């Protein structure tokens, strides 16, 4: 009889130890006790992060500010399927120690699917994810390239992305980068590198994921597709929108029978991805034309 | 907690108030102690049970005489249950008021489909279905109507069939009518009122149903399949032709899993539809053929 | 000093005691306590609860099958404040019995505003309103009465949409109907008039609302805009459609200063009133067209 309930506190430390891949997330881990956390905030744009507090009470030009942004924010999480069973009660000659090393990559396999789902998700046994998200939300400019045929995907597409992003967020905050992988293969052997490109560590000195142009910490990693027609870029403020709230934990029950002489490890992520304002991200595009 | 014996009571009284659907079933609901109930008698489908027994004792025709009515008088009910499940995860918020205000709908839609079965069902899983039992008595004898092209029968057929179980149905205590709502629109709001259709309230007296011919309360709709080829009428003496054996007083069990944090309840029901003799409803056709 | 905390239970209790407008100001009320009562449930839409479950059973069309379901069954609230002080500053040369003289009027302003927001309304801050509901429901199929003048003040409208919702729900429990004053005289003390609204109790018998059209009591309440175009009906069953997640037990906010020739008693309310299902209300129709 293996598998009582003792991997659990270890699995919590595994939850800590796997936000260690930050391939598409670093945000506000909202501690969740209820189910939804709404707030209907004074928005990013519109603020007016400063008002004068010594001169007139917002009159001429003007004090509101401008547009946008708007989305009624609310944070109710999602479940992720990962629940498993393995060569379960075969270990009935008293092993006990083989369990977490018999774990500790399947939890990673969960996390792989999780971060992919945050990159790519509608809401189905995983939360709301980016390429089914901003795809209809002021991201996909077409066409700032030429379908991987000597493309301008160098530093001027992300210039028309950073300048465009200047209202959705601000300037260089976070306004970062997440590419495909053939996107960064265009951005490998790129001329621009006007401040930095390859291998271009370069400072590193704040973030710096895998690649940097204008200090835009590129995520290569092919989590967003390419095949000419997909996403390729992400000048996005990652320090305002799009956080992952946290309920309690993915836990597990180590269920007994379960026939076929089997057990069950209910690996079961329990969080969400949702933004905050209208835009933060431009993805793509990097179409097939 | 809840999802418990504590809350089956506001989940079971819904039977008491909505066994009461006056849409398709009214009988002497037999209260059952055993299960496979059966009598062995031969009912009076030939009797005649004294001349006096006199100077003669009816010796010639016939020797039994006819059937019979040794079926023999079996009964064997039918399990009936939706699976019930609530958000068996989210509320630890003690809402409770919830599952009152959430359902009373399960017994209900349970009963809805149950009466779809009652009007219409081939005997297994369900007990007896009416139009399927009507589909053996030649209840839908051909023809009366004219295939959805200005159909003209008033209660003309009702007089004919009224004779046809003027046979061992007397008249109008009880003997009742279900029609279709297509039949409610091709006949109610006719001018007729042929003795009555319109307005058919017609006081409104005791319990009754919507509209009335000759005294007979009237139901319509749905569970009558239209398509011109039907019984768009349903006439029978309920009292003689058919009865309710009903066994299982309501049990639902609110054991938990059922995984994925959504657990298990089951709206168990064993009642049965059963009759006696031979042809007891004649109704339709009313053809498309 | 008064007007801070001395008569409040007063105001909530008399607000209970004329929460009393038999038009919508009672409904399917959930005395709520969550901020958003959310659930993800799948009520009476799709199932087919039990079915025979023994032989074949759900194997071809359609799987889900159609709706469904989901909404999700969130229940927020709407903040129904008032904000009428009077200046207690020098209006205080011994009054005090004005506290048994002042009030009363204010919740009257509350409830009138409450109903007119309730029947026509946008969801932004109110609930979405019932007359506007039928507009976004398009439940409002025209014509059935000719547009202020020679209006066919009938009830076959009523009967048609009655079985249409009896295609949806069932019949004659409750089924209700809110009329105009134009429909009040237009279907009170006309001739026939109609089905039944002569008398206009119409028995009275039931728990309470003036009129009864085969079970449809007659609500003027006078918020329909005339001008030939609106409904002059509200064909719905109450006891199917729409609940009231009614939230908060009201506290006034008799705040003192607010100085310089004034004071501040803001008042409050919080309820919500929420659609239960799909399209369960019809209206008019009767319009200008």
CB of B259 less than 8 A from some CB of A: yes
CA distance A56 to A63: 10
Residue found by looking up tokens 């997640």 in the block: C245
Q: Which residues of C touch A70 (CB under 8 A)?
A: none
Which stretches does DSSP call E strand in chain C?
29-31, 78-79, 82-83, 177-178, 218-219, 244-246, 253-255, 264-267, 270-271
CA distance A231 to B133: 62
- CA separation (Å) from B140 to A153, B110, B223, B235, C23? 75, 28, 16, 11, 47
Residue found by looking up tokens 């008019």 in the block: C284
Q: How many CB pairs under 8 A join A and C?
A: 7
Comparing CB atoms, the residue among B90, B259, B261 nearest residue A35 is B90
Work out the number of other CB atoms within 10 angstroms of the CB of residue B118: 23
Q: Which residues of C touch A36 (CB under 8 A)?
A: 36, 38, 74
Q: How many helices (H) and strands (E) does chain A have?
A: 5, 2
Q: Where are the alpha helices (DSSP H) in chain C?
A: 9-17, 105-119, 130-137, 156-168, 181-186
Residue pair A267/A106 in contact (Cβ under 8 Å)? The answer is yes
3-state secondary structure A24-74: CCCCCCCECCCCCCCCCCCCCCCCCCCCCCCCCCCCCCCCCCCCCCCCCCC
Q: Determine whether the interchain pair B260/A35 forms a contact, defined as Cβ–Cβ distance below 8 Å.
A: no
Q: Determine whether the interchain pair A79/B261 forms a contact, defined as Cβ–Cβ distance below 8 Å.
A: yes
Query: Helix axis angle, B106-119 relative to B9-18, nearest 10°?
Result: 40
Chain B: give the shortest CA distance to residue A83, in Å: 9
B213 CB burial (10 A radius; 0-12, 13-18, 19+):
buried
Task: Give strand pairing partners of A271.
Answer: A246
Residue pair A121/A273 in contact (Cβ under 8 Å)? The answer is yes
Q: Determine whether the interchain pair C38/A36 forms a contact, defined as Cβ–Cβ distance below 8 Å.
A: yes
Q: Which residues of B touch C170 (CB under 8 A)?
A: 23
> Which chain C residues in 21-50 lie under 8 Å from chain A, judged by CB atoms?
35-36, 38
Contacts of C among chains (3+ CB pairs under 8 A): A, B
Q: Determine whether the interchain pair B124/C55 forms a contact, defined as Cβ–Cβ distance below 8 Å.
A: yes
Strands B176-179 and B216-219: parallel
Q: What phi, psi does C181 have (nearest 5°)?
A: -70, -35
Q: Which residues of A touch C38 (CB under 8 A)?
A: 35-36, 76
Contacts of B among chains (3+ CB pairs under 8 A): A, C
Work out the number of other CB atoms within 10 angstroms of the CB of residue C245: 25
Q: Which residues of C touch A38 (CB under 8 A)?
A: 35-36
Chain C: give the shortest CA distance to residue B33, in Å: 23
Residue pair C279/C168 in contact (Cβ under 8 Å)? The answer is yes
Q: Determine whether the interchain pair C34/B95 forms a contact, defined as Cβ–Cβ distance below 8 Å.
A: yes
What letter would DSSP give residue A132?
Answer: G
Chain C: give the shortest CA distance to residue B196, in Å: 15
Q: Determine whether the interchain pair B220/C163 forms a contact, defined as Cβ–Cβ distance below 8 Å.
A: yes
Which structure tokens are listed for A131?
């390429």
Q: Which residues of A touch B261 (CB under 8 A)?
A: 79
Contacts of A among chains (3+ CB pairs under 8 A): B, C
Q: Determine whether the interchain pair B102/C39 forms a contact, defined as Cβ–Cβ distance below 8 Å.
A: yes
Which structure tokens are listed for C91?
């209006």
Q: Determine whether the interchain pair B124/C54 forms a contact, defined as Cβ–Cβ distance below 8 Å.
A: yes
Q: What phi, psi does C78 have (nearest 5°)?
A: -130, 135
Q: Which residues contact A49 (CB under 8 A, 6 or more apart)?
A: none
Q: Which residues of B touch A35 (CB under 8 A)?
A: 90
Chain C: give the shortest CA distance to residue B255, in Å: 19
Q: Closest residue of C to A38, CA-based?
A: C36
Chain C: give the shortest CA distance to residue A38, in Å: 9
Which of B15, B79, B26, B130 has the alpha carbon at shortest distance from C51? Answer: B79
Buried b (16+ CB within 10 A) or exposed e, B225-238: ebebbbbbbbbbbb
Q: Closest residue of B to A267, CA-based?
A: B260
CA distance B271 to A281: 60
Q: Determine whether the interchain pair C41/B87 forms a contact, defined as Cβ–Cβ distance below 8 Å.
A: yes
> Which chain A residues in 51-90 lie under 8 Å from chain C, judged by CB atoms?
76
Buried b (16+ CB within 10 A) or exposed e, B153-165: bbbebbeebbeeb
CA distance C170 to B111: 13
- CA separation (Å) from B94 to A244, C30, C31? 27, 14, 14
Chain A: give the shortest CA distance to residue B259, in Å: 9
Which of B120, B220, B190, B227 has the alpha carbon at shortest distance from C170? Answer: B220
Q: Which residues of C touch B220 (CB under 8 A)?
A: 163
Q: Which of A32, A33, A35 to mutate to test the interface with C (most CBs of C within 10 A)?
A: A35
What letter would DSSP give residue C244?
Answer: E
Q: Determine whether the interchain pair B93/C172 forms a contact, defined as Cβ–Cβ distance below 8 Å.
A: no
CA angle C66–C72–C74, rounded 5-degree value: 150
Chain A: give the shortest CA distance to residue C54, in Å: 23
Q: Which residues contact C226 (CB under 8 A, 6 or more apart)?
A: C148, C180, C182
> Which chain A residues in 174-203 lie under 8 Å from chain B, judged by CB atoms?
none
Determine the 3-state secondary structure of A102 from DSSP: helix
Residue pair B77/B244 in contact (Cβ under 8 Å)? The answer is no
Q: Closest residue of B to A80, CA-based?
A: B260
Residue found by looking up tokens 């300048």 in the block: A163
Residue pair A155/A190 in contact (Cβ under 8 Å)? The answer is yes
Q: Which residues of A touch C36 (CB under 8 A)?
A: 36, 38
Which structure tokens are listed for C253?
């906010």
Q: How many CB pairs under 8 A join A and B?
A: 6
**Long-range CB pairs of A162-167, under 8 A, 24+ apart, other chains included:** A162/A214, A162/A216, A162/A235, A164/A235, A164/A282, A165/A235, A165/A236, A165/A237, A165/A279, A165/A280, A165/A282, A167/A45, A167/A66
Residue found by looking up tokens 């260690």 in the block: A20
* B212 sits in which H/E element: strand B212-213
Work out the number of other CB atoms within 10 angstroms of the CB of residue B1: 10
Cα-based torsion angle of the residue sequence A257, A260, A263, A267 in order, rounded to the nearest 10 degrees: -120
According to the entry, how was the structure determined?
cryo-EM
CA distance B84 to B7: 13
Residue pair B235/B175 in contact (Cβ under 8 Å)? The answer is yes
Per the rule left: phi > 0, alpha: psi between -120 and 50, beta: everything else, B55 is alpha
Comparing CB atoms, the residue among C53, C54, C163 nearest residue B181 is C163
Chain C: give the shortest CA distance to residue A184, in Å: 40
What letter would DSSP give residue C98?
Answer: T
CA distance B188 to A202: 85
Task: Give strand pairing partners of A265.
Answer: A84, A254
Q: Closest residue of C to A74, CA-based?
A: C36
Q: Which residues contact A147 (CB under 8 A, 6 or more apart)?
A: A228, A229, A286, A287, A288, A289
CA distance B168 to A28: 80
């Amino acid at each position: 009889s293996s598998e009582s309930y003792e991997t659990i506190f270890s699995q919590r430390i595994i939850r800590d130890l796997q936000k260690e891949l930050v391939v598409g997330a670093l945000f506000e881990e909202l501690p969740m006790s209820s189910k939804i956390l709404t707030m209907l905030v004074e928005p990013d744009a519109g603020k007016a992060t400063w008002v004068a507090a010594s001169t007139y009470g917002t009159d001429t030009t003007t004090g509101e500010e401008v547009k946008g942004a708007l989305k009624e924010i609310h944070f109710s999480t999602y479940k992720l399927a990962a629940k498993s069973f393995i060569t379960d009660e075969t270990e009935e000659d008293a092993i006990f120690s083989l369990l977490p090393l018999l774990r500790k990559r399947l939890i990673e396999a969960h996390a792989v699917s999780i971060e992919e789902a945050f990159m790519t998700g509608d809401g189905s046994g995983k939360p709301k994810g980016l390429l089914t998200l901003a795809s209809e939300d002021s991201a996909k400019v077409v066409t700032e390239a030429k379908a991987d045929g000597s493309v301008l995907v160098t530093a001027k597409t992300i210039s028309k992305l950073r300048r465009k992003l200047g209202r959705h967020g601000l300037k260089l905050s976070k306004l970062v980068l997440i590419v495909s992988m053939d996107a960064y293969y265009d951005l490998l052997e790129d001329e621009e590198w006007q401040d930095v490109a390859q291998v271009g560590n370069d400072s590193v000195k704040l973030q710096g994921q895998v690649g940097r142009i204008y200090g835009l910490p590129v995520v290569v990693s092919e989590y967003f597709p390419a095949k000419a027609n997909s996403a390729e870029f992400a000048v996005i403020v990652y320090k305002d929108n799009f956080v992952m709230p946290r309920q309690r934990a993915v836990t597990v029950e180590r269920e007994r029978q379960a026939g076929k002489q089997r057990d069950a490890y209910y690996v079961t992520q329990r969080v969400n991805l949702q933004r905050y304002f209208a835009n933060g991200v431009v993805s793509g595009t990097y179409a097939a034309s």
